[PDB]
Amino acid sequence: TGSLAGLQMALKETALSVGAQAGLAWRAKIIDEQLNKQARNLDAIYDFNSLVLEHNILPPVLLEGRNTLNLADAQSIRISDRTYKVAKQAHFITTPPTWRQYLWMDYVKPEAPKEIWCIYTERGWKNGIDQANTILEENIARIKEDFGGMILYRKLLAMNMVSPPYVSHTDLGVTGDGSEIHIDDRVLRITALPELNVNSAEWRAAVAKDENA
Amino acid sequence: MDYVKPEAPKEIWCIYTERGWKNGIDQANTILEENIARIKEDFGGMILYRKLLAMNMVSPPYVSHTDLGVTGDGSEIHIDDRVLRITALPELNVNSAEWRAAVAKDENA
Amino acid sequence: TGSLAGLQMALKETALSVGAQAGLAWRA
Amino acid sequence: DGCCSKMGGINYCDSSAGRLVCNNGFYSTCYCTRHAVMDLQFLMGCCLWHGGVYPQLNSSGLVVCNDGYVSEECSLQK
Amino acid sequence: VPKLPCRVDGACDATIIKMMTDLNKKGIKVASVGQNYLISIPASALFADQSPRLNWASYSLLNEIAAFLKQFRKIAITVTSYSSKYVSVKRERALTLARSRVVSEYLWSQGVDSRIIFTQGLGSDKPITSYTLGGDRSPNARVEITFRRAV
Amino acid sequence: MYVRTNLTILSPGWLASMTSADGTHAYEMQKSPVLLVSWHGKVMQLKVEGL
Amino acid sequence: MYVRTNLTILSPGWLASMTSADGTHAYEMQKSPVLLVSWHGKVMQLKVEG
Amino acid sequence: YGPNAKSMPTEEGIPPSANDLLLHVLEGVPPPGSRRLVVSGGDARAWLSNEK
Amino acid sequence: MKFKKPPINNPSDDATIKLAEAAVSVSDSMLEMAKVEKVITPPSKDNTLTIPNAYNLQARASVDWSGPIEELTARIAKAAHFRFRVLGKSPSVPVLISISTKDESLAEILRDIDYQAGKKASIHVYPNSQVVELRYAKIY
Amino acid sequence: KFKKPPINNPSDDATIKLAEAAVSVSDSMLEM
Amino acid sequence: AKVEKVITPPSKDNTLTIPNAYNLQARASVDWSGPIEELTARIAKAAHFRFRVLGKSPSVPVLISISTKDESLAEILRDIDYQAGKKASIHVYPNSQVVELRYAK
């Protein structure tokens, strides 16, 4: 222990266990209050309603990576310039998504409970606060994933690298028997899902000028 | 070198604790000397390779790369695939008739 | 319970059971 | 203790930089998150620059790292 | 917490305020706009009459400035020297370059933890005052040390 | 769940819907303990107990 | 092209490859009018018509 | 080849590309099933999925 | 000679720090692609042709609305003293809008509603008959 | 005598940046 | 490093120089990773030039990657020429307002 001349606990864990829960619940309440204060700005920012396609179809989610290298083992490497992947596929919706299913944190008030008790209860309090902040940061990453994938889809459709979804509708007339009728039956079905095209000869570039003076 | 602080603990106790102290110091110096030998091995082997490549006694590694275009299906694309693979490893050559010598002059006055 | 400085029955059901019936009959 | 001394006291923790802000407009010298640029040069533990300690419990005192190297240095002597 | 560092080492806010106040009363101008910092030194407190030779007593002032510069964390420092008009353009361009070279060398010899130090001498091209009656006593013969605090 | 109201259901997403002649809506949807509605241009929440 | 040989092909880069038990190789690759090979320590070139 | 040959020939082909989990890692979403690690001293996040 | 630097605001919360950091990246992704889409297909027509202005379309309003289209358009027409008209069948999935402005004219409000309606509905104004007309798309 | 401030004012250096980002996103929506 | 490094003289460097016409100094903003012909045609169309191609397109196309925020078209053309390598070349005629993409035989 140091130099040559220098040579010549249950309440511990119970303190951490009551501090972590109280810190987590308190920080969760404060996070929810900050979310509810700013409710109109988040609706203006994460505007899912104005990204929806023709027949109320949610756009697919696309992901991009750049300047890629893999060292497969010794003796072999593989490199690429860009890669694009379809993470999620398009589908019909009845309602658009909202930010509340991503960002809202869950609160239940915990009502289920001295020399060194105070410092370790305080340390547990700090641990619970830090854990809540980490959870919120992962939620933020998830909502950013969904919005960024849809936004990237719009750009690649404009630059002619994906195909739009193709939809067919069939018109039946007045159908039914004498016990039940439906007046105007129409069945709608999307028959071609969006997909990337590998023919590179039709791809369209976009050059944006600036002009002044 | 790796450190973990040991916190896990009188007529003739002092002299033998002191002798154990000397033994531990000597052992640490020996360990460091073997590490020095190992790093010198790696650097000297690579440096010797450069000299023999210059003096034409080893062959360089030969590498091939293949260019794929835009590959993938409609669910995933990679824009510019290239695969690199070294096909000939370096090796000594036993034909002594192509070996090249190096004579270094000095000139003054 | 709350802040860090903050932390530092049979008659029950018998009462509900006689109240519910009387309220229901009177309102009926 | 005293971070913003001869300033107005602590305003808040800027987590974007990992630093405290004093009540005048100066950045403090104190850190307030662990993802701040601290200049770490000295680290403890053994089997660094290998995989770490392979977590089996041994009858003898040898300590083996995750890539097969054996730490004779953290190993207990006889 | 006991083994992580709790602050950047050797640095204190009271020490920063104390030394900045002492330097401003002594006569060296210390200014801060945003996160950029400027230290401006009159040439009479450092050099002889237009020679690149320091007096022996001005090394205490350079030591004081180095002790100030060790309080921050930074990437680049720029030292620029300016003088007054004496003979031609070339003589004072050479003079200011020599002055900046010597000052930045002593600062680099002391332990300022910067990655780059740039030095230049601009001669008598950029005056900060229209009163040009002094020689080296003029307020517009100076050396300026500028940097940006990083994070 | 089968929900009868004349508000407009926004968030949890429903499976089928019908409307009457005077403007009452009926929804069939999956279970959830909260509903998000628009009243007169204002978004609020309805709370469902008893699940 | 599908190439059957027991030389070692180095430069132009292949698509699928096999080796036999006695050391003969078979390769599938993209088209090129030249091949660079090295037989037992010596580098040479082959020229392909057709 | 009969039941004794002397052995079988050996196959190799195209090396596989980069693992597509890194797209989710780029976005900041942890890979599913992983667990968190604690990183000190700089701005980084880390996860452990398959002893990688 | 106390030293001070000018912006000294109220203290900040780190959740708001993280949301702001996400929002900046969302905003410049949006800006870049809107530039791309503007370059690729240039617009040629404007809805001033379909919604011209008039006297007593110059009363002003400030609005904060998050519902279906018909009620807001009816309120705007009633404030402008115009008759209100609906053409077509309303769809089963409702057409939702979200407007948050301050001090613009009723013609500008109607033009923003018409732009946000998109491919689902349209707004027309006939000033000689004093009629505001909303027509739904022939889809589904 | 008295001139009160707006009740929901972005009086915070993070809230301000959040509100400008919210402005620019909706302007971009209108351009689209 | 001094012995091993090989250089070329600035006289015989085969890279297209800046063609200093007036129309080619406008700033632009490009993100592209794909075939060379369509991007060069778009650059030419933006400069109010004509665009012509001399040669034969190969089976595997020539792929470039340009990602810039503010830059004039002449140097963008210079980067296209540098990245094309030995397989293609770009020539600019500023009297008859034309650019030309030439393939390698």
Short mmCIF file of N, CA, C and O in Angstrom, two decimals, chain B residues 2-108:
data_model
loop_
_atom_site.label_atom_id
_atom_site.label_comp_id
_atom_site.label_asym_id
_atom_site.label_seq_id
_atom_site.Cartn_x
_atom_site.Cartn_y
_atom_site.Cartn_z
N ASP B 2 1.62 -2.96 -16.80
CA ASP B 2 0.28 -3.02 -16.22
C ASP B 2 0.32 -2.75 -14.73
O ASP B 2 1.11 -3.35 -14.00
N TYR B 3 -0.55 -1.86 -14.27
CA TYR B 3 -0.57 -1.45 -12.88
C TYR B 3 -1.93 -1.76 -12.27
O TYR B 3 -2.96 -1.36 -12.83
N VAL B 4 -1.94 -2.46 -11.15
CA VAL B 4 -3.09 -2.51 -10.25
C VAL B 4 -2.58 -2.30 -8.83
O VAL B 4 -1.58 -2.90 -8.42
N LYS B 5 -3.20 -1.36 -8.11
CA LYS B 5 -2.68 -0.95 -6.81
C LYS B 5 -3.01 -2.07 -5.82
O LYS B 5 -4.19 -2.32 -5.58
N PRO B 6 -2.03 -2.72 -5.24
CA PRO B 6 -2.30 -3.80 -4.28
C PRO B 6 -2.64 -3.31 -2.89
O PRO B 6 -1.76 -2.79 -2.20
N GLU B 7 -3.90 -3.44 -2.46
CA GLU B 7 -4.32 -3.06 -1.11
C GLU B 7 -4.63 -4.27 -0.25
O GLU B 7 -5.53 -4.23 0.59
N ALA B 8 -3.88 -5.36 -0.43
CA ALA B 8 -4.17 -6.64 0.23
C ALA B 8 -2.94 -7.09 1.01
O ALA B 8 -2.12 -7.87 0.50
N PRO B 9 -2.76 -6.62 2.25
CA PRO B 9 -1.63 -7.01 3.10
C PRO B 9 -1.77 -8.43 3.63
O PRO B 9 -2.80 -8.71 4.24
N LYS B 10 8.70 -8.41 14.81
CA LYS B 10 9.18 -7.27 14.04
C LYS B 10 10.69 -7.17 14.15
O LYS B 10 11.29 -6.18 13.74
N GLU B 11 11.29 -8.21 14.72
CA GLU B 11 12.74 -8.25 14.87
C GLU B 11 13.46 -8.43 13.53
O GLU B 11 14.40 -7.70 13.22
N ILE B 12 13.02 -9.41 12.73
CA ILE B 12 13.60 -9.69 11.43
C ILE B 12 12.59 -9.52 10.30
O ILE B 12 12.85 -9.92 9.17
N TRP B 13 11.42 -8.95 10.59
CA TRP B 13 10.41 -8.71 9.57
C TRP B 13 10.88 -7.68 8.55
O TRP B 13 10.64 -7.83 7.34
N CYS B 14 11.59 -6.65 9.02
CA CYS B 14 11.96 -5.52 8.18
C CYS B 14 12.94 -5.91 7.08
O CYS B 14 12.77 -5.51 5.92
N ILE B 15 13.95 -6.72 7.42
CA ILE B 15 15.01 -7.02 6.45
C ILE B 15 14.48 -7.90 5.32
O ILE B 15 14.84 -7.71 4.15
N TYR B 16 13.61 -8.84 5.62
CA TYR B 16 13.04 -9.70 4.60
C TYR B 16 11.95 -9.03 3.79
O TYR B 16 11.81 -9.35 2.60
N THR B 17 11.21 -8.09 4.38
CA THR B 17 10.31 -7.29 3.57
C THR B 17 11.11 -6.45 2.58
O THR B 17 10.76 -6.34 1.40
N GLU B 18 12.25 -5.94 3.04
CA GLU B 18 13.15 -5.18 2.18
C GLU B 18 13.78 -6.03 1.08
O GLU B 18 13.93 -5.58 -0.07
N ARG B 19 14.17 -7.27 1.40
CA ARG B 19 14.69 -8.17 0.37
C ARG B 19 13.63 -8.51 -0.68
O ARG B 19 13.94 -8.59 -1.88
N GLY B 20 12.39 -8.73 -0.24
CA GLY B 20 11.31 -8.97 -1.19
C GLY B 20 11.09 -7.77 -2.09
O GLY B 20 10.79 -7.91 -3.28
N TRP B 21 11.26 -6.57 -1.52
CA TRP B 21 11.16 -5.33 -2.29
C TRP B 21 12.22 -5.30 -3.40
O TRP B 21 11.92 -4.96 -4.56
N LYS B 22 13.46 -5.70 -3.07
CA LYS B 22 14.50 -5.75 -4.10
C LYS B 22 14.21 -6.79 -5.17
O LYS B 22 14.46 -6.54 -6.36
N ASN B 23 13.66 -7.94 -4.78
CA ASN B 23 13.33 -8.96 -5.76
C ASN B 23 12.25 -8.50 -6.73
O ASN B 23 12.35 -8.75 -7.95
N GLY B 24 11.24 -7.80 -6.23
CA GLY B 24 10.20 -7.30 -7.12
C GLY B 24 10.69 -6.25 -8.08
O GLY B 24 10.31 -6.24 -9.26
N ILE B 25 11.58 -5.36 -7.61
CA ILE B 25 12.17 -4.36 -8.50
C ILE B 25 13.00 -5.01 -9.61
O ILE B 25 12.88 -4.64 -10.80
N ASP B 26 13.80 -6.02 -9.26
CA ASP B 26 14.61 -6.70 -10.27
C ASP B 26 13.75 -7.44 -11.30
O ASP B 26 14.05 -7.41 -12.51
N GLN B 27 12.66 -8.06 -10.84
CA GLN B 27 11.76 -8.75 -11.76
C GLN B 27 11.10 -7.80 -12.75
O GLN B 27 10.98 -8.11 -13.94
N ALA B 28 10.69 -6.62 -12.27
CA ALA B 28 10.09 -5.63 -13.17
C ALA B 28 11.07 -5.16 -14.24
O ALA B 28 10.69 -5.00 -15.41
N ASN B 29 12.33 -4.96 -13.85
CA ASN B 29 13.32 -4.54 -14.84
C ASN B 29 13.55 -5.60 -15.91
O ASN B 29 13.67 -5.29 -17.10
N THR B 30 13.56 -6.87 -15.50
CA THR B 30 13.70 -7.96 -16.47
C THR B 30 12.53 -8.02 -17.46
O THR B 30 12.74 -8.21 -18.67
N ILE B 31 11.31 -7.81 -16.96
CA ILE B 31 10.12 -7.83 -17.82
C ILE B 31 10.19 -6.72 -18.86
O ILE B 31 9.94 -6.95 -20.06
N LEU B 32 10.62 -5.53 -18.43
CA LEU B 32 10.75 -4.41 -19.36
C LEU B 32 11.79 -4.70 -20.43
O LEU B 32 11.59 -4.36 -21.61
N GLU B 33 12.88 -5.36 -20.06
CA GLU B 33 13.93 -5.65 -21.04
C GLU B 33 13.46 -6.62 -22.12
O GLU B 33 13.77 -6.45 -23.31
N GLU B 34 12.64 -7.61 -21.74
CA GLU B 34 12.08 -8.50 -22.78
C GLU B 34 11.11 -7.77 -23.71
O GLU B 34 11.08 -8.03 -24.92
N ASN B 35 10.32 -6.83 -23.17
CA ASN B 35 9.44 -6.02 -24.01
C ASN B 35 10.23 -5.20 -25.04
O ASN B 35 9.82 -5.06 -26.20
N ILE B 36 11.36 -4.64 -24.60
CA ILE B 36 12.21 -3.85 -25.48
C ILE B 36 12.73 -4.72 -26.62
O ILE B 36 12.72 -4.31 -27.79
N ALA B 37 13.12 -5.95 -26.29
CA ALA B 37 13.58 -6.88 -27.32
C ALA B 37 12.49 -7.18 -28.34
O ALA B 37 12.77 -7.26 -29.54
N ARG B 38 11.25 -7.30 -27.89
CA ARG B 38 10.15 -7.63 -28.80
C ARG B 38 9.85 -6.49 -29.79
O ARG B 38 9.66 -6.73 -31.00
N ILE B 39 9.81 -5.24 -29.29
CA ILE B 39 9.56 -4.13 -30.21
C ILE B 39 10.72 -3.96 -31.19
O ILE B 39 10.51 -3.65 -32.38
N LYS B 40 11.94 -4.24 -30.73
CA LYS B 40 13.10 -4.15 -31.61
C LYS B 40 13.01 -5.21 -32.69
O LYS B 40 13.40 -4.96 -33.84
N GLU B 41 12.47 -6.39 -32.35
CA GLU B 41 12.27 -7.43 -33.35
C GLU B 41 11.34 -7.01 -34.46
O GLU B 41 11.67 -7.18 -35.64
N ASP B 42 10.20 -6.42 -34.10
CA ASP B 42 9.25 -6.07 -35.15
C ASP B 42 9.79 -4.97 -36.07
O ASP B 42 9.76 -5.10 -37.31
N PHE B 43 10.35 -3.92 -35.47
CA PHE B 43 10.89 -2.84 -36.28
C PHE B 43 12.08 -3.27 -37.13
O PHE B 43 12.17 -2.91 -38.31
N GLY B 44 13.00 -4.05 -36.55
CA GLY B 44 14.14 -4.51 -37.32
C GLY B 44 13.80 -5.47 -38.44
O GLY B 44 14.42 -5.44 -39.51
N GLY B 45 12.79 -6.32 -38.24
CA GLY B 45 12.38 -7.18 -39.34
C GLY B 45 11.79 -6.42 -40.51
O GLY B 45 12.13 -6.69 -41.67
N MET B 46 10.97 -5.41 -40.22
CA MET B 46 10.41 -4.62 -41.31
C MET B 46 11.46 -3.78 -42.04
O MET B 46 11.46 -3.68 -43.28
N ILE B 47 12.40 -3.23 -41.27
CA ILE B 47 13.46 -2.43 -41.86
C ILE B 47 14.36 -3.28 -42.77
O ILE B 47 14.74 -2.87 -43.88
N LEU B 48 14.64 -4.52 -42.33
CA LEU B 48 15.43 -5.45 -43.12
C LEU B 48 14.71 -5.84 -44.40
O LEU B 48 15.35 -6.03 -45.44
N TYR B 49 13.37 -5.93 -44.34
CA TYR B 49 12.60 -6.17 -45.55
C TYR B 49 12.81 -5.07 -46.58
O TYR B 49 12.94 -5.36 -47.77
N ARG B 50 12.78 -3.81 -46.14
CA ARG B 50 12.98 -2.72 -47.10
C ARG B 50 14.35 -2.80 -47.75
O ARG B 50 14.47 -2.60 -48.98
N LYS B 51 15.38 -3.16 -46.98
CA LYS B 51 16.71 -3.26 -47.58
C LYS B 51 16.80 -4.40 -48.59
O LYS B 51 17.37 -4.23 -49.67
N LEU B 52 16.23 -5.57 -48.27
CA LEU B 52 16.30 -6.67 -49.23
C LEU B 52 15.41 -6.46 -50.46
O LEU B 52 15.75 -6.97 -51.53
N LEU B 53 14.31 -5.72 -50.33
CA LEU B 53 13.55 -5.37 -51.53
C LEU B 53 14.34 -4.45 -52.43
O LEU B 53 14.32 -4.60 -53.66
N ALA B 54 15.07 -3.51 -51.83
CA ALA B 54 15.94 -2.64 -52.61
C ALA B 54 17.07 -3.39 -53.28
O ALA B 54 17.42 -3.09 -54.43
N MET B 55 17.63 -4.37 -52.59
CA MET B 55 18.73 -5.16 -53.14
C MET B 55 18.26 -6.40 -53.89
O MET B 55 19.08 -7.27 -54.20
N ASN B 56 16.96 -6.50 -54.18
CA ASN B 56 16.35 -7.40 -55.17
C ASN B 56 16.49 -8.88 -54.78
O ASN B 56 16.84 -9.73 -55.59
N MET B 57 16.22 -9.16 -53.52
CA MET B 57 16.23 -10.53 -53.06
C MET B 57 14.87 -11.05 -52.63
O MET B 57 14.73 -12.25 -52.40
N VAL B 58 13.87 -10.18 -52.50
CA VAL B 58 12.50 -10.59 -52.26
C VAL B 58 11.60 -10.02 -53.34
O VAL B 58 11.95 -9.09 -54.05
N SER B 59 10.45 -10.60 -53.45
CA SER B 59 9.50 -10.06 -54.40
C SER B 59 8.49 -9.21 -53.67
O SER B 59 8.15 -9.51 -52.53
N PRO B 60 7.98 -8.15 -54.30
CA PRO B 60 6.93 -7.35 -53.65
C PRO B 60 5.62 -8.10 -53.65
O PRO B 60 5.43 -9.06 -54.42
N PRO B 61 4.66 -7.70 -52.82
CA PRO B 61 3.33 -8.30 -52.89
C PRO B 61 2.59 -7.77 -54.10
O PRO B 61 2.66 -6.58 -54.43
N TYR B 62 1.87 -8.67 -54.77
CA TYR B 62 1.08 -8.33 -55.94
C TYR B 62 -0.39 -8.33 -55.56
O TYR B 62 -0.87 -9.28 -54.93
N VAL B 63 -1.10 -7.28 -55.97
CA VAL B 63 -2.48 -7.04 -55.56
C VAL B 63 -3.36 -6.86 -56.79
O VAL B 63 -2.94 -6.28 -57.80
N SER B 64 -4.56 -7.44 -56.74
CA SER B 64 -5.55 -7.30 -57.80
C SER B 64 -6.82 -6.71 -57.22
O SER B 64 -7.23 -7.08 -56.12
N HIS B 65 -7.46 -5.83 -57.98
CA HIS B 65 -8.72 -5.24 -57.57
C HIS B 65 -9.74 -5.41 -58.68
O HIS B 65 -9.42 -5.24 -59.86
N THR B 66 -10.95 -5.76 -58.29
CA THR B 66 -12.06 -5.92 -59.22
C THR B 66 -13.10 -4.85 -58.98
O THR B 66 -13.47 -4.57 -57.84
N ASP B 67 -13.56 -4.26 -60.08
CA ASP B 67 -14.55 -3.19 -60.07
C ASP B 67 -15.91 -3.76 -60.44
O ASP B 67 -16.13 -4.15 -61.59
N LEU B 68 -16.82 -3.81 -59.48
CA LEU B 68 -18.21 -4.05 -59.82
C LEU B 68 -18.90 -2.71 -60.01
O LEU B 68 -18.40 -1.67 -59.56
N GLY B 69 -20.04 -2.73 -60.67
CA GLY B 69 -20.69 -1.48 -60.95
C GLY B 69 -21.64 -1.07 -59.85
O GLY B 69 -21.23 -0.97 -58.69
N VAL B 70 -22.90 -0.83 -60.19
CA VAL B 70 -23.92 -0.62 -59.18
C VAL B 70 -24.59 -1.97 -58.94
O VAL B 70 -25.31 -2.47 -59.81
N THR B 71 -24.37 -2.54 -57.77
CA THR B 71 -24.86 -3.88 -57.49
C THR B 71 -25.93 -3.84 -56.42
O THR B 71 -25.99 -2.94 -55.59
N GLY B 72 -26.78 -4.86 -56.46
CA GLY B 72 -27.80 -5.07 -55.46
C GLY B 72 -29.14 -5.35 -56.11
O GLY B 72 -29.29 -5.34 -57.33
N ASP B 73 -30.12 -5.60 -55.26
CA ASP B 73 -31.49 -5.75 -55.70
C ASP B 73 -32.25 -4.48 -55.37
O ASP B 73 -31.67 -3.46 -55.01
N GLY B 74 -33.58 -4.53 -55.48
CA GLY B 74 -34.40 -3.37 -55.23
C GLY B 74 -34.58 -3.00 -53.77
O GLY B 74 -35.18 -1.96 -53.48
N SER B 75 -34.07 -3.80 -52.84
CA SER B 75 -34.17 -3.49 -51.42
C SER B 75 -32.91 -2.88 -50.84
O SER B 75 -32.96 -2.37 -49.72
N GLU B 76 -31.79 -2.91 -51.55
CA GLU B 76 -30.51 -2.46 -51.01
C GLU B 76 -29.55 -2.25 -52.17
O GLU B 76 -29.44 -3.12 -53.03
N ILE B 77 -28.87 -1.11 -52.21
CA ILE B 77 -27.87 -0.90 -53.25
C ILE B 77 -26.57 -0.39 -52.66
O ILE B 77 -26.54 0.30 -51.64
N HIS B 78 -25.48 -0.77 -53.32
CA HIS B 78 -24.14 -0.26 -53.08
C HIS B 78 -23.67 0.37 -54.38
O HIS B 78 -23.80 -0.25 -55.44
N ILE B 79 -23.16 1.59 -54.31
CA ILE B 79 -22.97 2.37 -55.53
C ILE B 79 -21.72 1.96 -56.28
O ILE B 79 -21.76 1.67 -57.48
N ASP B 80 -20.58 1.90 -55.60
CA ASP B 80 -19.32 1.57 -56.27
C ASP B 80 -18.57 0.48 -55.53
O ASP B 80 -17.62 0.76 -54.80
N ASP B 81 -18.94 -0.77 -55.77
CA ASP B 81 -18.24 -1.88 -55.14
C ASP B 81 -16.88 -2.13 -55.77
O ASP B 81 -16.77 -2.27 -56.99
N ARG B 82 -15.85 -2.20 -54.93
CA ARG B 82 -14.55 -2.66 -55.38
C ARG B 82 -14.03 -3.66 -54.36
O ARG B 82 -14.13 -3.45 -53.15
N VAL B 83 -13.49 -4.76 -54.87
CA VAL B 83 -12.93 -5.83 -54.04
C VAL B 83 -11.43 -5.86 -54.26
O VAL B 83 -10.97 -5.95 -55.40
N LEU B 84 -10.66 -5.79 -53.18
CA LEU B 84 -9.21 -5.83 -53.28
C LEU B 84 -8.67 -7.07 -52.58
O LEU B 84 -9.08 -7.40 -51.46
N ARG B 85 -7.74 -7.74 -53.26
CA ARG B 85 -7.21 -9.02 -52.83
C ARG B 85 -5.75 -9.12 -53.26
O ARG B 85 -5.46 -8.94 -54.44
N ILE B 86 -4.85 -9.39 -52.33
CA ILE B 86 -3.45 -9.59 -52.70
C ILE B 86 -3.25 -11.06 -53.06
O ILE B 86 -3.60 -11.96 -52.30
N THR B 87 -2.76 -11.31 -54.27
CA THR B 87 -2.73 -12.65 -54.83
C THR B 87 -1.36 -13.29 -54.75
O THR B 87 -1.26 -14.52 -54.79
N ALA B 88 -0.30 -12.51 -54.63
CA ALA B 88 1.03 -13.06 -54.46
C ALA B 88 1.65 -12.46 -53.21
O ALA B 88 1.80 -11.24 -53.11
N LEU B 89 2.01 -13.32 -52.27
CA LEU B 89 2.67 -12.92 -51.06
C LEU B 89 4.16 -12.71 -51.34
O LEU B 89 4.68 -13.27 -52.31
N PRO B 90 4.84 -11.87 -50.56
CA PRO B 90 6.28 -11.70 -50.77
C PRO B 90 7.03 -12.97 -50.44
O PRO B 90 6.66 -13.72 -49.54
N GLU B 91 8.11 -13.20 -51.19
CA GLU B 91 8.90 -14.41 -51.01
C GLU B 91 10.31 -14.19 -51.56
O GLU B 91 10.54 -13.38 -52.46
N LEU B 92 11.25 -14.88 -50.92
CA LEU B 92 12.65 -14.88 -51.30
C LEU B 92 12.82 -15.61 -52.63
O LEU B 92 12.12 -16.57 -52.92
N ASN B 93 13.76 -15.15 -53.45
CA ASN B 93 14.04 -15.84 -54.70
C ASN B 93 15.41 -16.51 -54.65
O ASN B 93 16.39 -15.93 -54.17
N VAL B 94 15.47 -17.76 -55.12
CA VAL B 94 16.69 -18.55 -55.05
C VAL B 94 17.55 -18.43 -56.30
O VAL B 94 18.67 -18.94 -56.30
N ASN B 95 17.06 -17.79 -57.35
CA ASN B 95 17.91 -17.52 -58.51
C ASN B 95 18.85 -16.38 -58.16
O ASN B 95 18.43 -15.23 -58.03
N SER B 96 20.13 -16.70 -58.01
CA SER B 96 21.09 -15.70 -57.58
C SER B 96 21.65 -14.88 -58.72
O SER B 96 22.51 -14.03 -58.48
N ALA B 97 21.20 -15.09 -59.95
CA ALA B 97 21.84 -14.40 -61.06
C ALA B 97 21.29 -13.00 -61.28
O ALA B 97 21.90 -12.23 -62.02
N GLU B 98 20.17 -12.64 -60.65
CA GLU B 98 19.62 -11.31 -60.83
C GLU B 98 19.90 -10.38 -59.66
O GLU B 98 19.36 -9.28 -59.63
N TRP B 99 20.70 -10.81 -58.69
CA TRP B 99 20.88 -10.02 -57.49
C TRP B 99 21.75 -8.80 -57.77
O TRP B 99 22.68 -8.86 -58.56
N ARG B 100 21.42 -7.70 -57.11
CA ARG B 100 21.98 -6.39 -57.39
C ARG B 100 22.76 -5.87 -56.19
O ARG B 100 22.21 -5.82 -55.09
N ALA B 101 24.01 -5.47 -56.40
CA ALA B 101 24.87 -4.98 -55.33
C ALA B 101 24.85 -3.46 -55.23
O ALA B 101 24.48 -2.75 -56.17
N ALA B 102 25.27 -2.96 -54.07
CA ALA B 102 25.25 -1.54 -53.78
C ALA B 102 26.61 -1.16 -53.22
O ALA B 102 27.01 -1.63 -52.16
N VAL B 103 27.31 -0.29 -53.94
CA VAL B 103 28.61 0.23 -53.54
C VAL B 103 28.51 1.72 -53.28
O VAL B 103 28.20 2.49 -54.18
N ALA B 104 28.80 2.13 -52.04
CA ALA B 104 28.64 3.52 -51.64
C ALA B 104 30.01 4.17 -51.53
O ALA B 104 30.86 3.72 -50.76
N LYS B 105 30.22 5.22 -52.32
CA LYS B 105 31.45 6.00 -52.34
C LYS B 105 31.50 6.98 -51.19
O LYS B 105 30.47 7.26 -50.57
N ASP B 106 32.68 7.52 -50.93
CA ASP B 106 32.87 8.80 -50.25
C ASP B 106 33.84 9.63 -51.09
O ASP B 106 34.84 9.10 -51.58
N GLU B 107 33.55 10.91 -51.25
CA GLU B 107 34.42 11.83 -51.96
C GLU B 107 34.66 13.08 -51.13
O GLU B 107 33.70 13.72 -50.69
N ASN B 108 35.93 13.44 -50.96
CA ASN B 108 36.31 14.67 -50.29
C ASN B 108 37.60 15.20 -50.91
O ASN B 108 38.43 14.43 -51.40
#
